[PDB]
Amino acid sequence: SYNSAIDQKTPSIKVLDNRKLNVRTLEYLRTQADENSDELITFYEFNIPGFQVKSTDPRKNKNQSGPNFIRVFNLAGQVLREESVDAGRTITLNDIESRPVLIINATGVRQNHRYEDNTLPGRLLAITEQVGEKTTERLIWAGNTPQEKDYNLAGQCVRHYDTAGLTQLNSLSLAGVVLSQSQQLLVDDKNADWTGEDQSLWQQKLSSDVYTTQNKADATGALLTQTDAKGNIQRLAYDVAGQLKGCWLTLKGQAEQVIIKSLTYSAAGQKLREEHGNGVITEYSYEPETQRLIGIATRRPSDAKVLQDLRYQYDPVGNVINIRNDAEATRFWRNQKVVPENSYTYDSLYQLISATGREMANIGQQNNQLPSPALPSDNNTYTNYTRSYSYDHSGNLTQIRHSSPATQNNYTVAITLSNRSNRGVLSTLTTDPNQVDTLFDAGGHQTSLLPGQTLIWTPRGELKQVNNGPGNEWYRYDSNGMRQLKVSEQPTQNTTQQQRVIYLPGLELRTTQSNATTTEELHVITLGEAGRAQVRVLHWESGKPEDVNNNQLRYSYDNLIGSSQLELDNQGQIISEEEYYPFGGTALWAANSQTEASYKTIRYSGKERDATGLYYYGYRYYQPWAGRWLSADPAGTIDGLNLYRMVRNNPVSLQDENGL
């Protein structure tokens, strides 16, 4: 059911100058089959030494506004100034050895990097983020003492003080795999300011809890087993091809159970058949010719029940155009047992123009919140919807026209963009195209999420706080920019109501506390990669609910891009079921209990959905009601000049690893 009249006589032309530099790229856009294709010309200007000085997307060339980027290079070809129209201006200075010395980002924050002196090998020592002067990072290197060589610590960064605390490294294997590390966190009333020489006045800024984790690895450096920070041990086994074939978990004080008892693979190393300690068998089918995933068949071999069977169809180029489920509808939807077919169509640039699927009945309009679960008692159904998307010539999603018949909830939602930038907010915030760039930082990070919500950002462009009305939610990040803390402070009932999550290797320490006491303490043991059928274990140390049982195993079952759609217990019964709108909004949401729905945190593309609605994708935050990122691309023009675009506006076939 693919129509090739969309793609006739629409090639991609890269026009060259007399130096064979790509000075124009040419695209032809046909949205529907009968009409003519539209030539889009992206312009790249080069100076006389041959570096790309300015680049211009085809929408701002029609506006007669300036270029997207204005770069200034040195004589070697490295960028000294980059005046991006979405990410602001970046002034970068490197030394002789091409190490960064001075970085000024668009918010005016000067970053320093001081190194070792000329008698030492010149490794990194400290980083200073001057705004008024903070030594925000501090690296402690090791020597070649025979105590250091016993643990292979020679020439490593043993203590690494960063924006979230301390990351101490204890032992290395003979390959170079870290076998033991520990980490403390900065306290809530303190920021990273690691000034001075003595480290005894840096431990009074850190927490008392030192979270150490341990590993064991084979001679090939693959991780065999891993002890968490509490003592829960995961243990993996490998087959003769070096792939992974098994998994065992032993909680602290308990025996060793089985999480994955078999995992076979195809010839190309893709997953082929996997049986869990649940007992449920999933089986992946592939194309012979192209080795594309054409089937995910989740079968429970105790009732001969197929829980889901997703058969994918594709374009010739590899765009998902048809997903049908040959399973029956679950126990949450009474009186119906046929799952509708999801059909997708695309433009000539392979961006999603239309999408059908199923959604709940009492969902209403899509927003930042997720709807209430469909319990097995309230006998509710699902209905059919179809969404149609519209784009401008910069690739920004400008309009989602959700038209759902048989319920009369037909709504459109517009994204109001700038004329000079790709910065565009929802139409609830501003209807004027000229007051959109007042809602962003100078670096292009959005500063207001909703009409009553404001966002605060770090000096290095990371989300520091989502201010709601009465209750904020703030985060902390390490030197790589990965989130190590999430503290949700609800307003005053008689005191603050604080929920704290600590992100550790293979462990989430979700805890809830009032004024003086902890009212809930939850240790989520994770097994595997999120989006790769992850298994979670919810262990309650304090404040367990009445109806749930302790050490509850939640086996996640994922679709093509990793959206967690089915959760099963250790016996194989369904805990919670979810479907998604194509750009990530929760369309269908059924659960066994309301309190068993509160602990599903990883939802779409294997990414954790916060209480603010934003998905945390690594280096950036994503907002699914708009299909935009919350900030500009931190890496730059990796994927085109649109720094705010989603996955080439192709969110069914593609998915973004880690945001950047």
């Binding site: 995933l293 093509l560 076939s653």
Partner: peptide, 16 residues
């Protein structure tokens, strides 16, 4: 960066 479905990559249980 926008990559394809998760099935293409090798398994990874522990990294940074």
């Amino acid at each position: 960066a926008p990559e394809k479905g998760k099935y293409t990559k090798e398994v990874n249980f522990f990294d940074e």
